[PDB]
């Protein structure tokens, strides 16, 4: 049966996390975890934590078959953003954008 | 009494986007471009409603000329013979016959040739 876990309002850009999400889409969990834990990006650590949470969700809440478990759907969606003011030259002010992301991983044995 | 335009404008926008569903990018998403795309498509459809008859007439005349040329006669001579033979077959049926029925077009061509003399 399908298991869904997600992380909301993560302090990271959507594009940066999506650059890492495409690396493990459809891959085996056993190798996906190894790829995530040996990738030198903060978004890689975040998606590794989310994947570990999903894996734990697939054994404490689900029956069995951890070895054949495979990630099926992974996607990153942009979340609410924070508006901040960054002073610039000649008294000009620029509205800087801090983007949050919703990282959702969908995993099932099939 | 105050009147809110949030429903009629939304309905008009939805209708316009429906009329221009799937041209390219913003043309199928942005109303400000969708309206111009709809107007241009309507103008093109109006022009082609008349252009189609001319294009199909050109296709039919090309096919009839080719069919007459395999039989050893030009299109103009074939039409002159048909007119002299009191034959009022439109070029669409002539092209259909030439494409599908070879012997029928052969019979038409010798009748035109005989009417020429």
């Amino acid at each position: 049966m399908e298991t869904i876990a997600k992380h909301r309002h993560a302090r990271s850009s959507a594009q940066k996390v999506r650059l890492v999400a495409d690396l493990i889409r459809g891959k085996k969990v056993s190798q996906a975890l190894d790829i995530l834990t040996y990738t030198n990006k903060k978004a890689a650590v975040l998606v590794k934590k989310v994947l570990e949470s999903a894996i734990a969700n697939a054994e404490h809440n689900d029956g069995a078959d951890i070895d054949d478990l495979k990630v099926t759907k992974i996607f990153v969606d942009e979340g609410p953003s924070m508006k901040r003011i960054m002073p610039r030259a000649k008294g000009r002010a620029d509205r800087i954008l801090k983007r949050t992301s919703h990282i959702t991983v969908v995993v099932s044995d099939r | 009494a105050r009147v809110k335009r949030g429903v009629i404008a939304r309905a008009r926008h939805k209708k316009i986007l429906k009329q221009a569903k799937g041209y390219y990018g913003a043309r199928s998403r942005v109303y400000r471009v969708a309206f111009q795309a709809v107007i241009k498509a309507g103008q093109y459809a109006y022009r082609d409603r008349r252009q189609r008859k001319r294009q199909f007439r050109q296709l039919w005349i090309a096919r009839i000329n080719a069919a007459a040329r395999q039989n050893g006669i030009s299109y103009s001579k074939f039409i002159n013979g048909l007119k002299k033979a009191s034959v009022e077959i439109d070029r669409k049926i002539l092209a259909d016959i030439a494409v599908f029925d070879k012997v029928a077009f052969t019979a038409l061509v010798e009748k035109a040739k005989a009417a020429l003399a």
């Binding site: 650059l19 890492v20 690396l23 493990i24 040996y38 990738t39 | 990018g25 913003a26």
Partner: protein, 56 residues
């Protein structure tokens, strides 16, 4: 220098084709503890070529 027309999302995603990250496939297999590690690198517990290298 500044833009004259707004680039479309097609151009944005078309530029990002070469920005995809590359993923390792065959990091290593330890001959003593059998744990994955980088090529020519020590493991988490400082194991390389079978013999301990860090002594914690």
């Amino acid at each position: 220098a500044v833009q004259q027309n707004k680039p479309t999302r097609s151009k944005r995603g078309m530029r990002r084709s070469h920005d995809a990250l590359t993923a390792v496939t065959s990091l290593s297999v330890d001959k003593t503890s059998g744990e994955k590690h980088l090529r020519h690198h020590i493991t988490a517990d400082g194991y390389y070529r079978g013999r301990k290298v860090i002594a914690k």
